[PDB]
């Protein structure tokens with residue numbers, strides 16, 4: 340394959356998910372309340388349009404629609420205890436155009452992934468009731 | 480090229496070793512803070528050593544064996560007497576964990592590499608290691 344995967348950041352709970360790399364990420368939808376509940380990813384994969392449903396369905400959706408020539412070049416957030424579970428409390432992304440988030444209201448251990456060269460092409464991690472952990476595929 | 484980071488502050492001057500064929504060793508010089516790093520590596524048939532940061536601190540060496548690669552970097556950055564620098568720095572290989580080295584807490588960062596390896600470094604250096612970033616390959 341030749342994949343580059345960094346992360347996941349967060350807890351060891353939930354069940355592993357892995358969408359693999361995409362030809363093109365179309366949109367990312369972060370479901371969010373006190374904590375990061377979930378992430379939906381809409382993408383094309385070769386060339387068919389699929390959307391994957393990660394984490395849980397609580398919280399409020401916050402959608403990042405990527406325009407033409409717009410790519411994800413950063414991810415940051417925080418993970419910490421929420422009711423006996425270590426999950427992502429905050430999650431944000433930046434693109435080559437704009438910054439998004441963070442979404443979620445629970446402080447914890449910060450992580451940050453500035454990408455000086457390259458971009459995010461896919462996601463993996465762990466999900467249950469909430470988003471326990473999130474990691475990322477990279478490509479040039 | 481895949482470059483992630485750098486984590487740290489905006490002081491010092493920019494360094495960039497580029498990607499290596501193979502990392503041979505990493506020597507982290509630290510006391511209160513991360514002072515410097517020596518990286519020994521091969522590159523198109525040549526063996527090279529680069530030094531980043533200053534001359535202070537106590538050395539802690541990571542020597543990588545055959546088929547051993549760097550699969551993680553973690554640390555902390557913060558204001559140490561006027562400059563935002565790496566106060567703690569650690570690495571992990573596919574065999575072993577090292578450090579972190581340095582005694583000054585600040586803002587944590589972590590880079591676990593689920594697939595791929597660290598192949599090189601970039602960042603900023605002066606008296607101490609202001610910032611450190613990493614080249615990644617499969």
Ligand SMILES: OC[C@H]1O[C@H](O)[C@@H](O)[C@@H](O)[C@@H]1O
Nearest residue numbers: 371372373374375376397398
């Ligand atoms: O994020 C955890 C939780 O936070 C709040 O309690 C609400 O917004 C819920 O919908 C959500 O599931």
Ligand SMILES: OC[C@H]1O[C@H](O)[C@@H](O)[C@@H](O)[C@@H]1O
Nearest residue numbers: 371372373399441442443444
């Ligand atoms: O404004 C963003 C903000 O909106 C709501 O209050 C929640 O979904 C939060 O988790 C989120 O951070």
Ligand SMILES: OC[C@H]1O[C@H](O)[C@@H](O)[C@@H](O)[C@@H]1O
Nearest residue numbers: 352353424466467468469470
């Ligand atoms: O998502 C947080 C939490 O939700 C559920 O209770 C389970 O799936 C846990 O394993 C998981 O850690």
Ligand SMILES: OC[C@H]1O[C@H](O)[C@@H](O)[C@@H](O)[C@@H]1O
Nearest residue numbers: 490491562604605606607609
């Ligand atoms: O390395 C820490 C510090 O050392 C020197 O004082 C200068 O090179 C600064 O620019 C740098 O921030």
Ligand SMILES: OC[C@H]1O[C@H](O)[C@@H](O)[C@@H](O)[C@@H]1O
Nearest residue numbers: 509510511512513514535536
């Ligand atoms: O790390 C900063 C500083 O910490 C201590 O004072 C000593 O170990 C020095 O050698 C070093 O320069």
Ligand SMILES: OC[C@H]1O[C@H](O)[C@@H](O)[C@@H](O)[C@@H]1O
Nearest residue numbers: 509510536537579580581582
């Ligand atoms: O911070 C870890 C590291 O920092 C300095 O170099 C010294 O105090 C060492 O004894 C120690 O192992």
Ligand SMILES: [Zn+2]
Nearest residue numbers: 379391392393
């Ligand atoms: Zn969904």
Ligand SMILES: [Zn+2]
Nearest residue numbers: 504506540542
């Ligand atoms: Zn030695």
